[PDB]
C-alpha cells in the first residue's frame, strides 16, 4: 500500500535508497517464473548484511522467498565482520556499503572475508581509486579499502577492510560541465599463486597498445606472496585515467581465466578504457550511479554534472525512475550549447537530508 | 583432598622461601603405566620471565637442579609464564631427521607464587620482599604485582 | 558485576598444543637455559 | 523532450532509447572487443579530450543560491 | 569463563582508552606549544 | 599422546579432558559473541521463509 | 639404445648410435627390420604402425617403413645443427622438431614424403618438445631453464615458465589435457596446473640426473626413469612414490608407455631394454 516494487532490478538500488531515504519498501515477485524463486543466497545474506550495519530495520520474508517487506531503522554503522558467500564477491556486497557508509553512527571498519572479485562485478582496486576520488569529490576526506589478503574467482579466501571514518554532514554539492582534461593515465596489475613473468605480459601488450599517445602512461605490478595470495590462482589488471587539475577519474578492469593469455587481457582492458572514456562525460559510466546518489542527497539547491547522450540507457533509465519512485526528484536535462559534442547537464536538487545519526 | 595445593620452596640456609598455589595437577600414578621415569639429570627452558620477581623466581627455582647437563641429556622441563602463572611440563624427545617428536611425562601443573619472604620457613616474622596484593582495585590489570 | 582476579587458567588443547610447539621450537635451537659447571 | 520520455510511466527502457535515437551486474558494458580494437588501432579521435575567511564562506554560499537562481 | 573474557574485555578497553587519551593531549601539547613558543619569541623581541 | 586421555581401575577412557575443554570453551563462547552481538538491536529478520 | 618407440601392442622399436632402427615385437624378439641410417636420438611411429619417424645429431631428418626397402625419405640440413626430438600432433599428420640452432619446425606428411611449412625462432637451444594426445597445446624445453608453451591453431606464446635451476629435459603432458609435467637435471620433477602455471609438487628423486620422464595415458599417472638405474612411477593425486623399480644396471637413457593400458618399455645404457607389464 506505501511503495511496491517489481522484480530483482536494481535491487541493491531499491533496498539501500529506502534505508536512505527512511522509507519502508515491499519487493514481490523476485524472479518468480523461476524453477528457483525468489531471493538468491548472495542478496539474503546482503539483507542480514544491513540488518547488521543498521538498528531497528526489521526484514521479513514470505514462505514463497520472492517478497520482501522492509521497514528501515537507523544507520548505526560501526564495527563488524562479515562472511560473504562464495555465489559473489566482496564487491557487490561493498559497493552499496559505499555511499550508505559515511552518515552513520561510529566509523564504518568492517572486513570483508571470501572471494575478492570476478568478472560481472567490481574489483576491489576498481572501487579503489574509481570510486574512492569521486568521494573524495563529493565531500569525504578519510575513506579507505585496506586490501589486507586478496582471494580468488573459484576459492576466495581474501580479505578486505572498508574503512570510511569521514562522519560527513551531508555531501556537498558538485559543479561540474567541464569535460576533464586527462592528464595521467596509470593503472595496477595484481597477481596471486602465478608465475610473476604473467604480469609483465599483461603490462606490455596493454602500454604497447595504449603507447602511441602523448599521455603519461604508469601501469605498476603487484605479486601477492604468502598467505596474501588467496588459495587459487588468478590475476588481473585495472587501469585508471586520473585528472588531477580537478581529481576526476575513470576506469576498466578485468581478471584473467583458463586460457586467458596476457598480451589479450591487457588489449581488451585497454580498448574497454578506451571505450568508457570516449562514452563517457564526467564522470564514468559504471561511477554513474554513485554520482547521481550523492548528488541527489546533496544540500537543499541544484547541482549540476555533465553526461553526454551515450550516458543515457537503460540503467541510467531504471535508476531515475527508481530514485523518482523513492523519493520523487525529477532530474532537469539541460543541453550544453555547444552542439559538437550533444552533452546533458543534468541539475538535481537534493533532499534537504543530514545525518541523524550523531552525537553531539 | 588429595589435590595439591600448596608447595613451599624454602632454601633453607637463611634464605629466600617462596610459596607456590598449584592449581590443575595430574599424577601419572593415576594415569599412565609406561615404566619408570628417565631420571637423567635434565635441561630446563623456561618462557617469558623478564621481571624482576620473573628473574628472582627462575634464579631460586632452577638453582635446585644437578649442575651442568650434558648434550645427551634427555628430559627437558619447561616453565611457561602464562599471565602470572608458571605451568610445568617435562618431556623427553629424540631427533628425527624431520625435527624432534616429544613425548609427555611425570607431573603436570601450574603454579602462582603468592609469598616470597627473606627468612626461613619456620619464623614467620620474615621480612616480605614480595606477596601478591589480590584486593587493591587494579588487580586483574598486570602482572608480577 | 565486577570481579576482583582473573580466573583459574583451565588448560585447553590449545593451550598444550601453544606449549608444545613452543618447547619443541625451543630444542630444535637446542636453547635451554641450564646451569654450568661453574 | 526527454526529461517527460524517461518519466512516462508506460514504456520500457529499451523502447525509450529506441524512441529517442538488470544493475546487479556491475559492469559497464561493452562491444565486441576484435571490433572496439580495429577501430581504435588508432586513438587519435579521444586527442581533443586528451592533452577573509567570513567573507569567503558568504561569498561560496551567496553564489550557491545565485546559481540555484540562475538555473531556476 | 564470563568472568575471564569480560575482564580481558575491560582491561583491552582501558588500555585503549589510555592510548587515546594519551594521544590527543600530547598533540594538543606540543602542534599548539609550538605556535606558542613562536609567539613567544616574537614577542619577547619587541 | 598419552596425557589427553585418563584411565581407572579395571573389572580405558571416562572421558577427554583437552578435547572436553575444546568443546566445552568454544560452544559458551560463541554463546557469548551471539549474546553480545544481538544484546541491544531491535531489527531482527523472522524466523525463515 | 637412444630412445624407444612403441606400437599400441604389437611392435616396438629401439633407436642407437648406429643406426639400429630394430623393429621387435614382444612375443618372439627377433629384430624385423634391421638397417643402418647414423647417429639417431629420437623417433617416433605413424599411427597405423610400419612407418618410422627418427631425427639424428647431424643435420638430418630422416623416415623409414618396415615392409618395402629401409630408406624412402629423408632431409638433410632440416636444421644446420644438432636436432634433439620430434613430434607427431595427436592425429598423425603434422611434425614438430626441435634444434639447436634455436628453432622449431613444422612439416607436413605428403604424397610419400615431407614439406616444411612453418619455422619458429627461439631465444635460446631448445631440446625438448611435447605436443598435447588432442593438440590443444605443445611445450618446447629451452636449456635457458624455461618451459614454453604454445598453442596449435595459432602458436600464441601461451604459457612462458621458469624454476628448475638447470636445463629441463624432458616434458609430458596429462592424458585429458589438464597438467604437465616437468623435469630437469637437478632431481626435482615438477607437476605443473595448466590454466595459469601454478606448481603443485616440485618433487625429488632419481638421486642424480632425472632422464626422461612419461605419462600413464589411461588415468594421471606417470612413470619416470633415473640416470642412476631406476624407474619409478608416481601417482598424480597423492604425490607419492607408489613403485620403485630398481633392476637396470646403468644409465637408464629411455622409456615409453603403451597405450592400450598403460604398458611399459624401458631401455638403459647396458644395451638392455625390458618390458613392464601389469601384475
Known sequence: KYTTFQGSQNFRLRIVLATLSGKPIKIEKIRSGDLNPGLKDYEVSFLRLIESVTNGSVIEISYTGTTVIYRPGIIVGGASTHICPSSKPVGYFVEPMLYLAPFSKKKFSILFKGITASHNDAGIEAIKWGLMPVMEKFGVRECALHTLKRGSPPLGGGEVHLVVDSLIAQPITMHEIDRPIISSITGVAYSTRVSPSLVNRMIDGAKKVLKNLQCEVNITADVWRGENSGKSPGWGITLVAQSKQKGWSYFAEDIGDAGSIPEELGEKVACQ?????????????????????????????????????????????ILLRDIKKIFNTEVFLKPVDEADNEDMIATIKGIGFTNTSKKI | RGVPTSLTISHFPHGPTAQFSLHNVVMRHDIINAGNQSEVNPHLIFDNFTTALGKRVVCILKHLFNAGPKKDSERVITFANRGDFISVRQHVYVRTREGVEIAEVG??????????????????????????????????????? | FDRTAKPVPVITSEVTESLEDMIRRRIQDSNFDDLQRR | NIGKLIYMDNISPEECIRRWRDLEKFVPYFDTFEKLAKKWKSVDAIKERFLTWYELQKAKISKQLEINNIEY | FEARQRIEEKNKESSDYHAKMAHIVNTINTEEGAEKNKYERERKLR | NPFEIKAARNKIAVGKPGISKQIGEEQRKRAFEARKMMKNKRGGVIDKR | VRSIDISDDNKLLATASNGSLKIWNIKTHKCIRTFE?????????????????????????????????????????????????????????????????????????????????????????????RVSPDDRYLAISLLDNTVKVFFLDSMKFYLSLYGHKLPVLSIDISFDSKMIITSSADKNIKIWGLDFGDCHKSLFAHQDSIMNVKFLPQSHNFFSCSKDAVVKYWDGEKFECIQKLYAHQSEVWALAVATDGGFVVSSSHDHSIRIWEET
Not at chain 1, 546518489?293 to 544540500?299: E, L, P, S
Not at chain 2, 616480605?128 to 602482572?143: C, S
Not at chain 7, 647414423?38 to 631425427?55: E, H, Q, R, S
Request: glycine share 6%; with cysteine.
Open chain 7, 37 to 129: 641410417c647414423g647417429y639417431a636420438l629420437t623417433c617416433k611411429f605413424l599411427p597405423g604402425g610400419l612407418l618410422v619417424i627418427l631425427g639424428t645429431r647431424n643435420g638430418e631428418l630422416q623416415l623409414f617403413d618396415l615392409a618395402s626397402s629401409s630408406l624412402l625419405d629423408t632431409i638433410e640440413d632440416a636444421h644446420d645443427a644438432a636436432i634433439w626430438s620430434l613430434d607427431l600432433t595427436s592425429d598423425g599428420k603434422r611434425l614438430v622438431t626441435g634444434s639447436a640452432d634455436k628453432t622449431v619446425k613444422f612439416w607436413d606428411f605428403k604424397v610419400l614424403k615431407l614439406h616444411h611449412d612453418t619455422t619458429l625462432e627461439l631465444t635460446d637451444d631448445i631440446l625438448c618438445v
Open chain 1, 273 to 317: 578504457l578506451l571505450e568508457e572514456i570516449s562514452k563517457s562525460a564526467a564522470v564514468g559510466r559504471n561511477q554513474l550511479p554513485l554520482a547521481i546518489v550523492y548528488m541527489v542527497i546533496g544540500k537543499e539547491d541544484i547541482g549540476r554534472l555533465r553526461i553526454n547522450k551515450e550516458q543515457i540507457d537503460e540503467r541510467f533509465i
Open chain 2, 107 to 145: 607431573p603436570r601443573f601450574e603454579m602462582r607464587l603468592f609469598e616470597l619472604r627473606l627468612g626461613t620457613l619456620e619464623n614467620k616474622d620474615a621480612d616480605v620482599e614480595w606477596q601478591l596484593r589480590r584486593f587493591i582495585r587494579t588487580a586483574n590489570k598486570k602482572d608480577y604485582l
